[PDB]
Amino acid sequence: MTIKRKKVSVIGAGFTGATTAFLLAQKELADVVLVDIPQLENPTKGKALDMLEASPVQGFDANIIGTSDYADTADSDVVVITAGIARKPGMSRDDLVATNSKIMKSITRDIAKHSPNAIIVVLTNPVDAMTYSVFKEAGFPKERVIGQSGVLDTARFRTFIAQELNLSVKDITGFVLGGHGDDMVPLVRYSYAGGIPLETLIPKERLEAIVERTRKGGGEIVGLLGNGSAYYAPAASLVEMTEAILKDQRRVLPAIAYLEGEYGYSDLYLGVPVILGGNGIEKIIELELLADEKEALDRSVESVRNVMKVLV
């Protein structure tokens, strides 16, 4: 009967998790629960309190708490998973998946136990295999376990194109399938400035350089920082997906989604175009791909399946 706010729990209180929590609160999307391990309870509480203390300045009405008790996550509408070790250049997907999947087992069980009807959005890398690991543990329908990947890659692409052309980011679009790095399958033919195909505005070699920059983009930020990794753009990407869900917007966005026949593939998570709304994955949209795009995507599938073999 009482009209109540949405609730989001953000798992992992490192910079991407904390930043996601703040951005959600700032937009008055939900009350936020920022979660981390018991040994880090006080820093988690400190982050959440600092965020809360910003709220009267900017004027946003949100509760934000820090916790190590999954009871506090009960009946979350969305749970965003940012826990685990960050991807770095020179780390193999296989080592990272072994590390992160071991951490995540107990986490997924605790999430699902307290919010049986949550939609889970996974940041943790390598996200194609990690989203699968979460899906297998959670006991949820596939539509409710999704990963983040292409929003961030398209954000970086759009930034690079916007700076190349000196144009508003509002009017640039990018399009990617697959995953990050060598797994990314960009469709520059579906990438525009104000709807105008980018191939007509930027010469081939420059556009190739921008695509390569996009492939390497997370590593670029890691290299500049010296220690740490990106978190503003990853957080913003998580929040855009979370907002689509909480507000049932039926956005068309790239997401890491479970395939059972789509694009000819089955039984893995892969970056694909989806309609995102209040049910989670509303639809996977199947494009007519050109031969080269389809070969690239086949390679991305094989790569993801190789990383999956590591899971126990």
Place this chain on the structure above:
Amino acid sequence: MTIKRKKVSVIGAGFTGATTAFLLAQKELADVVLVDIPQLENPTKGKALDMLEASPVQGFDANIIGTSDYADTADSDVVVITAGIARKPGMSRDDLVATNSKIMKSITRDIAKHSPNAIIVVLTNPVDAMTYSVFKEAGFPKERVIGQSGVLDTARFRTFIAQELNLSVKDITGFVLGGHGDDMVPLVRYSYAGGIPLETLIPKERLEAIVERTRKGGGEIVGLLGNGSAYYAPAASLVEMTEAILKDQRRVLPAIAYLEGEYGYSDLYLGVPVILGGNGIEKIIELELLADEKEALDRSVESVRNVMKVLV
């Protein structure tokens, strides 16, 4: 002739500076220049790039660059100074001022040389003496050199009251003069919920406890974090002041401002109520204080003047 964006430079690329840069960009208030020392050029660039790469997601049109070259700060409308060592419990104001004022001399000279008509907003602690140090080096009129203090303290107070009463932060107000900690002179008689005096809504001892929490509030966040300090609420406070200036809003806010007779004091910076707009300090508003408030403020003045003696 070309209509151009405002420009803000943020000095110091630690968490409060970076966060301020992001929040300004996010609000499309200005193009942002994030500055730090040459030895940290790549991390500064990495922070700025990550922020920029968030912009297509959220849709904000801002340039954000990282630099170590004060040439890039030229003709800034506002310069926000966040550089220096953070305040911590057990650090004396005298030691911190010696440290931070030595760092700041060359910084202020570089700011003023490149943006002779800037308004400078100072975060660096101890802010009453540090704002004075910046004022003496810059060669600017007093109205254009201001410090941040009471916005953050009132933000924390409002958060505590909002949680005590379970009421919107939008409707709680606080009122403080002086500075932080033992220097704070709160006026609970000018603190309300929806205009209703808080003394009528909360018993004396609880209200006293909340005032004491406000006095200790930065240390509270330092203690929970274990390493580091607050940055979301300090950043939000800087941005509110910056916005008032850039948009000539003539907000009524507590600020650290130079006194030449106001409240009976001269030749120091002190936290006082001001009208903040496109000239910087538009007016210092002189209240009729009660005897106890005036004694407290006299003590705060003596404390600030004692810290000033350290400056060389």
Place this chain on the structure above:
Amino acid sequence: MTIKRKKVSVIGAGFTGATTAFLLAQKELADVVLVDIPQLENPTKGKALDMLEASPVQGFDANIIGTSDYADTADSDVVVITAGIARKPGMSRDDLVATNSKIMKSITRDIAKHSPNAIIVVLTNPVDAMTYSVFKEAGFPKERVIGQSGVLDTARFRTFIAQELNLSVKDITGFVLGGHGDDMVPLVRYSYAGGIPLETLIPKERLEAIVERTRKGGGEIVGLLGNGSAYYAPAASLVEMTEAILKDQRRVLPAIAYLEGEYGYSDLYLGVPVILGGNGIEKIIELELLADEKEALDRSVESVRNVMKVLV
């Protein structure tokens, strides 16, 4: 299971109703249903379509439909009533209440039948008696039938004070009990600029003139327009109340609420300070009034009760 948007129906597609619908949609607060009589179905649809066609420009995701079929209002979270004849100078409350209460009977029944758990917010004048008429027909708990009055009066007051002092509207507050016009009981002692009492900033006669302007403020707009009445500020006031409810903000705001002992009165609606949130009226806040304020409020009560005698 599907996370779904809130739903608001706005009854009456004149300028205040249409404007409320647009502002709600613009803020992505809800899907909106704009309702009017069957004979005006096409204009209602035309208004709603024009609003909907604005949505891609500004980027807001809202459904907005026009209708004459109360089936389309089913399961509304909030229903905002703007139907009826507008108040004008020289119209007596007694004539207006007879007119508007006859119109409203069938409307309230239709609302309650289709959304038994709605919170109703009433604009229609004379709002103290009209909210009562809606309350008696609806079969809802008092907390879920509320009227708008003091938000608009305080908005006008704040505008006048802001212009007098040349200060941000963000920092001015006003405080009123009762209703409009001669029924308004302002508390200038609870009215501030940045928390500073306005009696200390503006001389008595000027402040009296601004209070009188507030009393007459709706008529002022009627007189300037020549035909029609205010709708931007009334719409904004409705939306602020609606937002408080939909987002469970627990705002402290003046509202027209049913009294059963509060302030010593019973069995009428009266403008009083409330906490507004997801249950509707969360609490009526009882102030300690001065003798003159209490006499004024007694007169306002007698005036409202005299208008109530007209209801059949």
Place this chain on the structure above:
Amino acid sequence: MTIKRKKVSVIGAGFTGATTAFLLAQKELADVVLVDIPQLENPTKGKALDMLEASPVQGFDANIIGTSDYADTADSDVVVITAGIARKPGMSRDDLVATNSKIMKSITRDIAKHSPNAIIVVLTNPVDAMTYSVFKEAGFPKERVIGQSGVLDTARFRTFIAQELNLSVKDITGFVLGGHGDDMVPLVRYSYAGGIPLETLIPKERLEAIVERTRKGGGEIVGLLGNGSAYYAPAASLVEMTEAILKDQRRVLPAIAYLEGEYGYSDLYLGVPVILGGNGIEKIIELELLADEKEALDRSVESVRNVMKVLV
């Protein structure tokens, strides 16, 4: 030296002009001056006052005045022209241009006299010929005299497509050249859902029906209303263009711009893709058109030139 707000004057205080003024103020883009003839001074003031009185509710800091004295428009950054008779079905372009161009002569002279460096955005129909009439009277460079057309047409298209597909309006794009109605040259090949070509998602006949609906869209709203015309979506379209200019965003948008060789045409205004920023028209973007598109655009040019012959 004082940092000051931007200033926009909106000429014509009918519903599209008033609505534009409100939306600009609401976004804190500028101080607004709403202008109309001396005989309508009081209603213009009444509209502006009602808007201003909304500002404390929503919290926006803007001055909004109503006037009949072009002195009050002095040094406007942008002037938006909404004055004149609205287009209706069955009104010929030739009659409307004779009517509206006679009204506008004195208006343009008064604008240019008081704001010699303004950018003028023209709504008044028939906009291709009316923008030309304003350009010839104003004495301004072509880049600073522009008309609105394609933003509104693309907004309606995007609304129709969004409803057809049940997808976020944020992710639909449309693309039009020329002008309204029979003059519109849509490029459905440059129209997408999340970058996916709409021709792959909607069958030909449905897409044709949606294009025809777009051609007729202003008349549709006129027919539903019975009296009056659209104003929410036209206002939103004006504000998007104004925002691009005031914030130097370099948006890629359709606009009515003066051609001196672009697309092979000279010496008329025509709807074309532009980069819009702080100089006005930053660039006209020349597409490679297909034979059918180019024939359609040639017909649109001939139609505009025929209406131009009416101008004296």
